[PDB]
From a paper:
The full-length, wild-type SHP2 (FL-WT) contains three domains: a protein tyrosine phosphatase domain (PTP) and two preceding Src homology 2 domains (N-SH2 and C-SH2). In diseases caused by SHP2, mutations are often observed at the N-SH2/PTP interface (e.g., E76D/E76K), resulting in constitutively active protein and abnormal cellular proliferation. The recently developed inhibitor, SHP099, allosterically closes the protein and deactivates SHP2 by stabilizing the N-SH2/PTP interaction.
Therefore, we used a truncated SHP2 lacking the N-SH2 domain (ΔN-SH2; residues 104–529). As a single point mutation at the N-SH2/PTP interface (E76K) results in opening, we predicted that the ∆N-SH2 would resemble the completely open structure, albeit crystallizable. In agreement with our expectation, cross peaks in the [1H-15N]-TROSY-HSQC spectrum of ΔN-SH2 are nearly superimposable with the corresponding SHP2-E76K peaks, assuring that the ∆N-SH2 construct mimics the full-length, open conformation. Remarkably, each structure shows an approximate 120° rotation of the C-SH2 and PTP domain with respect to the auto-inhibited structure. A rotation, and not a detachment, of the C-SH2 domain results in a distinct C-SH2/PTP interface, which is stabilized by several electrostatic interactions within the C-SH2/PTP interdomain linker. However, in our four ΔN-SH2 molecules we observe both states. The WPD loop (chains B and C) is displaced 10 Å from the surface of the protein to the out conformation, and overlays perfectly with FL-WT structure.
Author numbering: 106 to 153, 164 to 238, 241 to 312, 324 to 528
Amino acid sequence: DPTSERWFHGHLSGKEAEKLLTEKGKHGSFLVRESQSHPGDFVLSVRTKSKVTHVMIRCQELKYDVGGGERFDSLTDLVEHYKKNPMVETLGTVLQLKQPLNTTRINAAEIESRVRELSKLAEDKVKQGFWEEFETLQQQECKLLYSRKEGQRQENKNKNRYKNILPFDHTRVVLHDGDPNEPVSDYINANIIMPKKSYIATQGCLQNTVNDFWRMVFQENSRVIVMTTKEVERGKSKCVKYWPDEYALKEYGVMRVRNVKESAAHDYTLRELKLSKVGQGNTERTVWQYHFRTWPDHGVPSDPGGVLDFLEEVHHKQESIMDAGPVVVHCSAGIGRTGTFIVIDILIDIIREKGVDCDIDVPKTIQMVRSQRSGMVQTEAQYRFIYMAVQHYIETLQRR
């Protein structure tokens, strides 16, 4: 632990660093690494005909220098030196050290250190570190423009709650058996999310898509639904009730749904729904609806403790059913709260398998999720909550 700054990536291979600079960085981006060839020493990787240069740094008696010149007492002073006194590469390219490439990989057991550092003001020091990580993603969202022609069709205009929140065509959920009396019948504002596990992120049902929604649940073999919104939030409707009252039977087109039993918790309510198709016998599936009804709209839940307990119940219910389809998650647009909960669940699965000493990367996981649905995780508050969720989960595993 020579420095605390995030431009120190620790153990990172030279070959691997050439990718992070070429993809997540611009001209003049730099980063320091642990030397793979010479233990104890370090490497300074700078991007610049986009090239990556590897400047090797020596560590003699805790003194740093690049082969020759004045020797520094700390590695952070060395970086500041060659930022105002640039070096010249052998290919005539001057190494302009403009912006650092802050790291995003963190050892799960060492997450508290990253949260405590992201809370410091990041350099002129107008916002915290969480803000800079969150804008690094919103900036890299431009290199993420896939086609969305199916969502923009005239036939599907009334099937989308928001005109500019549409599903990608290469991950869209395509409905097969539909109604020939419809210009288009295979479209629902939803996407399949894959890191074993897969999720379905969809919008809150409109009045004219309740029937389509259940045609997706039945088609996809889904047995668990996670609703993360109330029916109404401050006068505005965020999701029409697509399930029937308890002990009631409602028919949604070719589909049949019965609310057998409900279980109430302070943060959520569990509804046991039996889903069948009209006229077809022994097609009845039990769909579990977990309705989280204490999540504010653009805010975050009160404590990560209630969300993680809720989160674990979804996990156990999924594995208790044999060969259950993807888990259907939806808020109102299926973007902010939906992504936050999916992003958390993906990370917890990484921890369930590898343990507390694994490498987590929340931006890399969010960006990997955003390539499958537009702009998952909406606000910065939700972004900080993901860390606060993992940290609270790591702490519980460390006790006992």
